[PDB]
Design a protein around this ligand. Structure first.
Ligand SMILES: *[C@@H]1O[C@H](CO)[C@@H](O)[C@H](O)[C@H]1NC(C)=O
Ligand SMILES: *[C@@H]1O[C@H](CO)[C@@H](O)[C@H](O)[C@H]1NC(C)=O
Ligand SMILES: *[C@@H]1O[C@H](CO)[C@@H](O)[C@H](O)[C@H]1NC(C)=O
Ligand SMILES: *[C@@H]1O[C@H](CO)[C@@H](O)[C@H](O)[C@H]1NC(C)=O
Ligand SMILES: *[C@@H]1O[C@H](CO)[C@@H](O)[C@H](O)[C@H]1NC(C)=O
Ligand SMILES: *[C@@H]1O[C@H](CO)[C@@H](O)[C@H](O)[C@H]1NC(C)=O
Ligand SMILES: *[C@@H]1O[C@H](CO)[C@@H](O)[C@H](O)[C@H]1NC(C)=O
Ligand SMILES: *[C@@H]1O[C@H](CO)[C@@H](O)[C@H](O)[C@H]1NC(C)=O
Ligand SMILES: *[C@@H]1O[C@H](CO)[C@@H](O)[C@H](O)[C@H]1NC(C)=O
Ligand SMILES: *[C@@H]1O[C@H](CO)[C@@H](O)[C@H](O)[C@H]1NC(C)=O
Ligand SMILES: *[C@@H]1O[C@H](CO)[C@@H](O)[C@H](O)[C@H]1NC(C)=O
Ligand SMILES: *[C@@H]1O[C@H](CO)[C@@H](O)[C@H](O)[C@H]1NC(C)=O
Lengths: 135, 135, 135
């Protein structure tokens, strides 16, 4: 949330990179670094805080009632066939893949019916994704 | 949340990288580093905090009632066949894969019906993902 | 949450890397490092804190009632066949795999019906994932 990077290959503060087939002959490198860093993140100052929830019921009739959670899956159908016939023939199935429901990165976080939240929360993702490398 | 990186190959503060087929002849490297780092993360100051929940019921009729959790799976069908016939033929199935429901990284975190939360919580993911490398 | 890295190959503070087929002849490396690090993470200051939950019932009728947990699996069907016939033929199944429901990394954390939470909690994942390397 402050100093988040995505760095492909090389990361450095001071880099004297030298690579194939070079001459580094009579150099006189000199450095003088002062890199102070003061972090005061998420410092808080609270005198009072109240999280109050009340429920009063009385002399009431509560008939057929449903409270359903956030995500519901019902009557979901995946009906993928694969019929292959061959009579005096040549078939060369190379790098053939059939992909059905699939995830890689799944993060859920208090997806509820009732929630009273105070504070800090976050979700950070960094990857190098690559599905198929079919050479 | 502060200093999160994704670094591909090389990470350094001061790097004098030298690589194939080079001459590093008469150099006079010199360094002088002051790298102070002060972290005061998540320091808090609370005098009072109350998490209050009450429930009062009375002289009430509560008939057929359902409270369902966040995620419900019902009547879910995966019906993938694979019929392969061959009569005097050649078939060369190379690198063939059939993928049905599958996860890699799954993190859940207090996905509830009722939640009273105070404080800090987060979810961080860093990977190098690669599904198929079919050379 | 502070200094989390994902570093591919090399990690260093001061690195004088030298690699194949090089001459490191008359160098005069010199260092002077002061790398103070002060961490005061998660220091707290509380005078009072109350987690209060009460439930009062009285002279009420509670008929057919269900409270269901967060995740419910019902009537889930996986019906994948694999019929292979062959009459005077050649079949070369190489690197063939059938994948049904499967996980690698699964972390759950107090996904409940009722929860009163105070403090800190998090979930961190770092990997090098690779499903199939079929050379
Ligand atoms: C630097 O090095 C080269 C070597 O080829 C030399 O000829 C030259 O006199 C040097 N200079 C100093 C200032 O040392
Ligand atoms: C290097 O940095 C320090 C930091 O104050 C300074 O006092 C000094 O003059 C600088 N130069 C040299 C040659 O040390
Ligand atoms: C708020 O400021 C500082 C904390 O950073 C502290 O000196 C002061 O007393 C705090 N206020 C109260 C009411 O505690
Ligand atoms: C509502 O009540 C009737 C009978 O009073 C019942 O048949 C029906 O199933 C109830 N509603 C639901 C959604 O179940
Ligand atoms: C640096 O090294 C080279 C070696 O080829 C030499 O000729 C040169 O005189 C040197 N210079 C100093 C200042 O040492
Ligand atoms: C190096 O850094 C220190 C830090 O204060 C400084 O006193 C000094 O002058 C710098 N230079 C040398 C050559 O030490
Ligand atoms: C808030 O500020 C500092 C803690 O960082 C402390 O000196 C002060 O007493 C705190 N306030 C109370 C009411 O404790
Ligand atoms: C509601 O009540 C009736 C009878 O009073 C019952 O048949 C029905 O199943 C109830 N509702 C549900 C959703 O079960
Ligand atoms: C550095 O080493 C080389 C060896 O080839 C030499 O010729 C040169 O005089 C040296 N320089 C110093 C300053 O030692
Ligand atoms: C190295 O660092 C120290 C730290 O204060 C400093 O006193 C000194 O002058 C620096 N240089 C040398 C050559 O020691
Ligand atoms: C809050 O600040 C510091 C702790 O960091 C301490 O001196 C002070 O007494 C704390 N407050 C109370 C009420 O204890
Ligand atoms: C509700 O009550 C009736 C009889 O009073 C019963 O048949 C029914 O099964 C109840 N509801 C549920 C969901 O079981």
């Amino acid at each position: 949330s402050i100093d988040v990077k995505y760095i492909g290959v090389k990361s450095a503060y001071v880099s004297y990179d030298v690579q194939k087939r070079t001459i580094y002959l009579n150099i006189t490198n000199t450095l003088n670094i002062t890199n102070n860093n003061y972090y005061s993140v998420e410092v808080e100052n609270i005198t009072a805080q109240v999280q109050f929830s009340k429920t009063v019921i009385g002399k009431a009739r509560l008939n057929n009632i449903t409270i359903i959670g956030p995500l519901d899956m019902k009557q979901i159908d995946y009906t993928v066939p694969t019929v292959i016939a061959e009579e005096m023939s040549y078939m060369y199935d190379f790098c053939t893949l059939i992909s059905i429901k699939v995830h890689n990165i799944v993060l859920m976080m208090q997806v509820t019916v009732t929630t009273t939240y105070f504070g800090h929360s976050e979700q950070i993702s960094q990857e190098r994704y690559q599905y198929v490398d079919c050479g």
